[PDB]
Amino acid sequence: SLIDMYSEVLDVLSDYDASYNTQDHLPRVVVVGDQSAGKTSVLEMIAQARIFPRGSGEMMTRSPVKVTLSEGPHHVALFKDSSREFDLTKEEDLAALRHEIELRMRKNVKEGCTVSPETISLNVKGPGLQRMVLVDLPGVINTVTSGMAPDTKETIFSISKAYMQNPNAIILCIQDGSVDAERSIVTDLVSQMDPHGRRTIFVLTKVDLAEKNVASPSRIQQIIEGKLFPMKALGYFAVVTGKGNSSESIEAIREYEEEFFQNSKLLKTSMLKAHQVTTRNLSLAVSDCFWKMVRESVEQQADSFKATRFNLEVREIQEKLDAFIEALHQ
């Protein structure tokens, strides 16, 4: 419940005063990537539910979506400051929840705008879920298409920058394996925010399409070894997080990914490695990295609180953080 404590420190910290005495440098896992690279698909394989706007060919995530993942006895979801439990095993609840999320996303987008920086906050609890706080972000673009507000590209870059810029955020850089590395839009921003790769994890999606279309299966190995993209990362993972145009289920997608990798030239040849491979493996590394960064960040931000009290002399913000750092040490 300490993930529960953490998240309440997070969403009472916002609020968002935003100043010298109150910086928000607490770890979140921030999911960035070109439009349709599969950011939301990765999120849904980790949350294990089909609940968010998702689809190929167009802009689907039009505002940030903050998901706190915690352990629980039933797969459930609740909005922030709400008591309604959506039962993620019931299709009627899933369908209702998809509608409720789309409606809030549409509500956030003001009249002459295409995208919003207003967050949608949701808790997902479930048996065996990794504990973590993620933020799914709008896909970065290069071309503003007809109907969109003219500023949309720069607004989307601005929303991604706002979250990657937090020095203790984990940057989960989602990279479409089915599209030439040279076509990538997000690489430059990722490289600016974390030049040395101290808090970035790299995810290559759609490797099944890569085999089904690409003329150099060694370039996949070159990517996963950090040798192709001009950026650094703590780790590199290859992943299969969907198939086709129609929404499948999480279990169908997980089966498909397992089949693909166990039949893939890349693993049987040991071109790339087994620990580098499924979303499950990515999940574990991301959770480890998130918790390590939380344990290395809270005190120094305890520290900040301490500095604030007197240096000058942040009220109940400091004591929620103090309760959490209390629990945190076993």
Ligand X SMILES: Nc1nc2c(ncn2[C@@H]2O[C@H](COP(=O)(O)OP(=O)(O)O)[C@@H](O)[C@H]2O)c(=O)[nH]1
As a whole number of angstroms, the distance between CA 45 and CA 275 comes to 17
Cis check: omega of the bond before 136, within 30 degrees of 0: no
Q: Which does 209 bind (CB under 5 to 8 A by kind): K ion, ligand BEF, ligand X, none?
A: ligand X
Residue from the set 181, 250, 271, 323 that interacts with a copy of itself by CB under 8 A: 181
Best CA proximity match to 85, nearest among 98, 95, 75, 99: 75
Residue from the set 3, 30, 33, 134 that interacts with ligand X by CB under 6 A: 33
- Tally of CB atoms within 10 A around 220: 22
Residue 125 DSSP SS3:
strand
According to DSSP, residue 25 is labeled: -
As a whole number of angstroms, the distance between CA 237 and CA 40 comes to 16
Site stretch for K ion (CB under 5 A), options 15-23, 53-61, 93-101, 164-172 = 53-61
Residue from the set 28, 39, 66, 254 that interacts with ligand BEF by CB under 6 A: 39
Residue from the set 7, 48, 61, 160 that interacts with Mg ion by CB under 5 A: 61
Q: Which two tokens stand for residue 54?
A: 């998702």
Burial of 77 (0-12, 13-18, 19+ CB in 10 A): buried
As a whole number of angstroms, the distance between CA 73 and CA 276 comes to 29
- Give yes or no for residue 175 binding ligand X (CB under 6 A): no
Residue from the set 36, 130, 166, 276 that interacts with a copy of itself by CB under 8 A: 36
Q: Does 206 show up as a binding residue in the annotation? A: yes
As a whole number of angstroms, the distance between CA 47 and CA 43 comes to 6
- Give yes or no for residue 206 binding ligand X (CB under 6 A): yes
As a whole number of angstroms, the distance between CA 301 and CA 22 comes to 10
Burial of 83 (0-12, 13-18, 19+ CB in 10 A): exposed
- Give yes or no for residue 218 binding a copy of itself (CB under 8 A): no
Site stretch for ligand BEF (CB under 6 A), options 31-39, 162-170, 268-276, 279-287 = 31-39
Residue from the set 27, 34, 39, 97 that interacts with Mg ion by CB under 5 A: 39
Instruction: Give me the residue label for tokens 């529960």.
Output: 4
Q: What would the x/- binding string for a copy of itself be over residues 245 to 274, using CB under 8 A?
A: x-----------------------------
Residue from the set 182, 251, 313, 316 that interacts with a copy of itself by CB under 8 A: 182
- Give yes or no for residue 56 binding ligand X (CB under 6 A): yes
Residue from the set 141, 170, 239, 286 that interacts with a copy of itself by CB under 8 A: 141
Q: Which two tokens stand for residue 155?
A: 């607004």
Q: Which residues pair with 103 in a beta bridge?
A: none
Site stretch for Mg ion (CB under 5 A), options 20-28, 54-62, 112-120, 223-231 = 54-62
Q: Which does 264 bind (CB under 5 to 8 A by kind): a copy of itself, K ion, Mg ion, none?
A: none
Residue from the set 13, 109, 228, 314 that interacts with a copy of itself by CB under 8 A: 228
Return the H-helix or E-strand segment holding 322.
helix 317-328
Q: Are the C-beta atoms of residues 130 and 22 closer than 8 Å to each other?
A: no
- Give yes or no for residue 35 binding ligand BEF (CB under 6 A): yes
Q: Over the Cα atoms of the chain, what is R_g?
A: 20
- Give yes or no for residue 181 binding ligand X (CB under 6 A): no
**Contacting positions for Mg ion (CB under 5 A):** 39-40, 61
Binding-site residues from annotation for Mg(2+): 40, 61, 136
* Binding-site annotation, residues: 36, 38-41, 55, 61, 136, 206, 208, 241, 244-245
Residues that bind ligand X (CB under 6 A): 33, 35-41, 54-56, 60-61, 139, 205-206, 208-209, 240-243
